[PDB]
Design a protein around this nucleic acid. Sequence first.
DNA 1: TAACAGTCACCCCCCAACAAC
DNA 2: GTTAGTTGGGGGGTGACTGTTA
Length: 194
Amino acid sequence: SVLASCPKKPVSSYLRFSKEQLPIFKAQNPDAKTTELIRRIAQRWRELPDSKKKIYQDAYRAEWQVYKEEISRFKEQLTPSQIMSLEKEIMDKHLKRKAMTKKKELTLLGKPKRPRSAYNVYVAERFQEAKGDSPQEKLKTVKENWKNLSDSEKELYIQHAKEDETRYHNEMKSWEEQMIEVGRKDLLRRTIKK
DNA sequence: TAACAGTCACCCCCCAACAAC
DNA sequence: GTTAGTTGGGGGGTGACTGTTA
């Protein structure tokens, strides 16, 4: 809301060079990986004479003065309700990035998935053939079918979930022991269910 | 820290139900 | 009690990789 129209900080020298250089390198090397083009761009920035870098730096200093002006002008027009909604948006965006960074590290570290419930088991088996066009309609079908299962049929799902709670217990015991060996005791559970 | 960007390989959120903090 | 992560796919999104700077 407020954060969308908020003036944004200017781009520093190298990033300004990189933005202009990447389309040129991408034109001349269309099947190359961007990571590799960025590595060459950064080598070109390092070799660049200081008199050329200064040209970029001077524009940055001047863009920073425009920024101070825009950000003062913006903030001054804001009501306390706006400021407050701006600070919440910034907080939410920060929290969401922090949580995604923590999740990607757990995937990189090979963390075992949580146990699958008898219901998760049923969604896995039943989804493909469940009536519905879109995945949201098919899930509404599945959930209703789950509601109507006999004890006889529900037992199969209950037994698959029992096995997965054992796999979860085994996998966790060894992953936690490995996290300790790599010095990541912060990743371990505080509480474990009996 | 997070600004620029293309690609990869997930991640989150919706619809729903069902251990760890 | 509340949050987060799971089974399913698909829309819409982003951190890691490649870098430097303020």
